[model samples]
Target chain A: SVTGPFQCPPLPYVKNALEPHMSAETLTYHHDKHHQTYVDTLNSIAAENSTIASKTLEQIIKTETGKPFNQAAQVYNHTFFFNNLAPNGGGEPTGKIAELITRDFGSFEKFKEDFSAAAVGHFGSGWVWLIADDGKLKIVQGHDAGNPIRESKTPLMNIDVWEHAYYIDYRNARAQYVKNYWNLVNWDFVNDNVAKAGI
Target chain B: GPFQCPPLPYVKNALEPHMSAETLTYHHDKHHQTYVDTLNSIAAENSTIASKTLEQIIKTETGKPFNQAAQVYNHTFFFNNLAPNGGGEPTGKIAELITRDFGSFEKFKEDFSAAAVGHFGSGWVWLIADDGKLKIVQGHDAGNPIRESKTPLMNIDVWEHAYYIDYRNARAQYVKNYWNLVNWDFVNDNVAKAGI
Candidate 1:
């Protein structure tokens, strides 16, 4: 956090930590520039309205509309995405999230296929999420500032399908970018979100 | 697909070294084609919409159907608004109208460039013929002038997918380079058709 209460959260990893798959320059633009712009815009909006400033990012996302809601949802979403990435993360999960994936999505491979399909087949700018809805794992597509929390579902994992998210590294090859995404997912953070959901 | 993904006026690499072949391939073949494919698929499931013209679908529907149809319309217009050896100043009837409405061709470029570059999010900035007068406008995410019953003279697709491959995050550069690609002849035709 650096500015107002709704500041840009620092990426848990260094800019270049997720190299090869995601370039250093991509992170610089994606995080320092794009994410920072969202936070800056949100802070300015929050500063103007006490009701907005008083509310948390989650609170704002679930209730607010227009610019405030868009900015807040983006901040929360980007923070979650960055924090859940790791330098050498990805592969199979071992905890409750793993067990839940198998139970809800048939098998581990099926879950991976479903997740990849959600990210790959998504149209235009938005997010694809794996959420805990009524204790069941489900895939959700949130257009623009769409968030699962707004619908009372607990988002366990998400990938931004906005072109900017992968355009720098993958150009228009969103499928390849999504394929590489699996290698950088911090499964630990995913499991942690599941545990906190208590679903 | 009933709605064709029209072939480019020029070959894939014709727009290079400004817009790359790689960019054109994915944009036209992938993104633009996907929109057409989606609209076709949806139309196949709905007899009511299946028979409507592209413009009719855009004028009548909302949600995914409208979005896809408008995109098909937008992309077709956007692709033609550029030519391999086009650009520079307006020269002819369209020039006179631009000079009249916008106060000089250079001034028009200045204003249009700013709108195209400064437009936020996925959308387009167009030089449209509204009420028999030329005006610059912004259309957010699949928005088109036809929906407002206005005449779309020309448009620059500001979607990230439009220029991300060539310019990354510097939309200004893409906007600047687009000047070198603007097909003034098409603008002339549109303005003439608009009866301006």
Candidate 2:
């Protein structure tokens, strides 16, 4: 079988590296099953559609809807989310990303407060993103399969708030899971995204 | 509190093993209760719709009030369809309708399970009665079939929260296991009462 249209990016750390905070069981199902399904479905869609098979995932995201758009955007979003984590990578940012966090949101504490609310209060399946808009950092919620990459802003980092993302460990207490997530967030990855965006 | 959670039709742990007690605790105590609280608060804040019944409010409103109202109703309906001893297949009228409208019970199960699993995000999959025939429909985030002029007979919440505790990311498996937990007697009662 030929593979090309989409592929699951290797998770940066061992499944259990984020353990106690994010369980290996959660990662196994989330990455192995859920993420893999999206990749498989995206590939199958591409296989059958000559026009879509020709375009890159980014091009398909901007130009499609229904099945293809949902699958492609989810593939991108999950990759961004997983890459934004590290074994001992949470606390706060340093350098440019930190400076901009304070500059745009008034203070890092304020930014955390607003971002926490967006992640916790989001009604259902979605993601909470720290995006760079007009060279300023902002917190935004993306409803199911929504990705900021489709918009004008650059997605700096994101936390998947979909229940499957945290339910095994957190259940209905998303705030608890999100609080622990700060302990695993790879600031370097976010900073790199900001630098690449040139914002 | 102007509203109350409908008594959970079964004990918290009754559906255990298959549906965890922990899941019921969180799904009911937190998820369902929150919706009830939000609905009451919205009603209290808006004098216009506050006086209306849940159904009336659902039909007449939009935005926050409508979502909360529909959710309150849907959650109650969903809970009513699950029982400790409720699975297998329906008997009598509902059985006949399953064959008449859906070909066979197995086919109906497959179709409903597919809809429940395939629902992209937080939403619902419903078995509804339309013009005296059965239909499967998908409702996204607080959407109710009543608003579409359809009579909902049963529903399985596809919100990941619905089965995430027990099944994790295996929604298809969760939906597959649902067959063993459906309260067919209640379904029959609903069909008989609906005069379909």
Interface RMSD of each: 1.9, 1.0
Candidate 1 backbone collisions, by pair:
none
Across B1-196, the per-residue lDDT of candidate 2 in tens digits comes to 5666787888899986678788788888898998898878876787876787778767778887888888888888888988889889888898999998889999998898888878898999889999988999999988888887788888898898888878777788888778878988888888988899
lDDT of 2 by residue, A117-191 (tens): 888888768999999888878888899988877888789989999988888888777899999998988999998
lDDT value, candidate 2, whole model: 0.86
| DockQ (0 to 1) for model 2 | 0.82
For all candidates in order, state the fraction of native interface contacts they contain: 0.45, 0.94
**Any runs in candidate 1 off by more than 4 Å, and if so which?**
A1-5, A44-54, B1-3, B11-18, B33-52, B61-66, B89-91, B99-115, B118-120, B133-137
Best by lDDT: 1
Please write out the lDDT profile of model 1 over residues B93-144, one tens digit for every residue: 9989988998898999999999887765688998888888888889888888
DockQ versus reference, model 1: 0.49
* Candidate 2: regions farther than 4 A off: A1-5
Cα error of candidate 2 at position B113, Å: 1.8
Best candidate, DockQ-wise? 2
